[PDB]
């Protein structure tokens, strides 16, 4: 049956300024079926309280979810989004780059 793979974007709500609070976001889109596991990570450790929007889909019927967490960027702390779906032979890990 159809299986489309997620696009992944990891980014912050606002322009990242260290010491200032923000939200780390991970937008997954263009996928099918809806079963996906998305983790936001801080220095490789899985962030515990990450919320996500409610499952919607686009005109072509593929799904999108936003995952997000309150975070204060620091110059040392690394953040990434690990994503897993049936399309991926291994969980896709995308790192957060502040200029992206």
């Amino acid at each position: 049956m159809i299986q489309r793979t997620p696009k992944i974007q990891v980014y912050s709500r606002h322009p990242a300024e260290n010491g200032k609070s923000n939200f780390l976001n991970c937008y997954v889109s263009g996928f099918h079926p809806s079963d996906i596991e998305v983790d936001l990570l801080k220095n490789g450790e899985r962030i515990e309280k990450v919320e996500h929007s409610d499952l919607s889909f686009s005109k072509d019927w593929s799904f999108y979810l936003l995952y997000y967490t309150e975070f204060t960027p620091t110059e040392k702390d690394e953040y990434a989004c690990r994503v897993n779906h049936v399309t991926l032979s291994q969980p896709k890990i995308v790192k957060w780059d502040r200029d992206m």
Binding site: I2, R13, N25, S29, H32, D54, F57
Partner: protein
């Protein structure tokens, strides 16, 4: 400005581990305002926008009751389509439905939508005249014959040209501050040195509402369509969206490039240049 109300529904079968998952959401333009989730504690339609929160208990009980009827109807459909497609009872499957309406700047009806998909492909859709169906295959044709006989389209026509438009309008006037705004994009460019001879030049659009934007680079007036890394418009999480377009510039050529931003809220399109 044109506006649209759309409802999106997903049923996914959980063979052996229970009753299917049904998630309903509702949107006026790019703002989600309601949701129902089968696996949620409450078993009620819930507000997802503050402007719908002060609707009455009448609205919430009324919307809860209707979405729960929807939920039941699609878990019947998961069985029916597994029969129509002669699938095993073991596999997980997906039905999606979407319907809604569009108005013009005048807030009068433009278009109504009503369509289903089984496992990510179009199953059946009401055609634009809101009188006929587009049934994909033989199973969607069984379904078309059914809804033809029971005059489902004439009744649907009445929701999408009447009571959908009426609600959208109401929502627009009740959620006026969120719904009738135009956040114009805050634009800016960055310059990262990829090497001694190359650099990325990224044009940002941020905090704009609605989601529609054209962010486009150019070199000496020529479209740079294959040479631009354009990302998918993304939610900022606060009800605005973000987007960037980037090009790798041969050192010394930065002046050749212009980024062009078109959005509802820009009196005129922007042409940005690194300088």
């Amino acid at each position: 400005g044109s506006h649209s109300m759309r409802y999106f529904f997903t049923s996914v079968s959980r063979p052996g581990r229970g009753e299917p998952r049904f998630i309903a959401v509702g949107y006026v333009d790019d703002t989600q305002f309601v949701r129902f989730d089968s696996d949620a504690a409450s078993q009620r339609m819930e507000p997802r926008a503050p402007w719908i929160e002060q609707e009455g208990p009448e609205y919430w009980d009324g919307e809860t009751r209707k979405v729960k009827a929807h939920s039941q109807t699609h878990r019947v459909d998961l069985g029916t389509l597994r029969g129509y497609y002669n699938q095993s009872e073991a596999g997980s499957h997906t039905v999606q439905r979407m319907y809604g309406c569009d108005v013009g700047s005048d807030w009068r009806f433009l278009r109504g939508y009503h369509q289903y998909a089984y496992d990510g492909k179009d199953y059946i859709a009401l055609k634009e005249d809101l009188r006929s169906w587009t049934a994909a295959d033989m199973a969607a044709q069984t379904t078309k014959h059914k809804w033809e006989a029971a005059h489902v389209a004439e009744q649907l026509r009445a929701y999408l040209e009447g009571t959908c438009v009426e609600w959208l309008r109401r929502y627009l006037e009740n959620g006026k501050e969120t719904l009738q705004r135009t956040d114009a994009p805050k634009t800016h460019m960055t310059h990262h040195a990829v090497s001694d001879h190359e650099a990325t030049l990224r044009c940002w659009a941020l905090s704009f509402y609605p989601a529609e934007i054209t962010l486009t680079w150019q070199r000496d007036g020529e479209d740079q369509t294959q040479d631009t890394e354009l990302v998918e418009t993304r939610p900022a999480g606060d009800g605005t969206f973000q987007k960037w377009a980037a090009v790798v510039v041969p050192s010394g050529q930065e002046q050749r490039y212009t980024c062009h931003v078109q959005h509802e809220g820009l009196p005129k399109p922007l042409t940005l240049r690194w300088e």
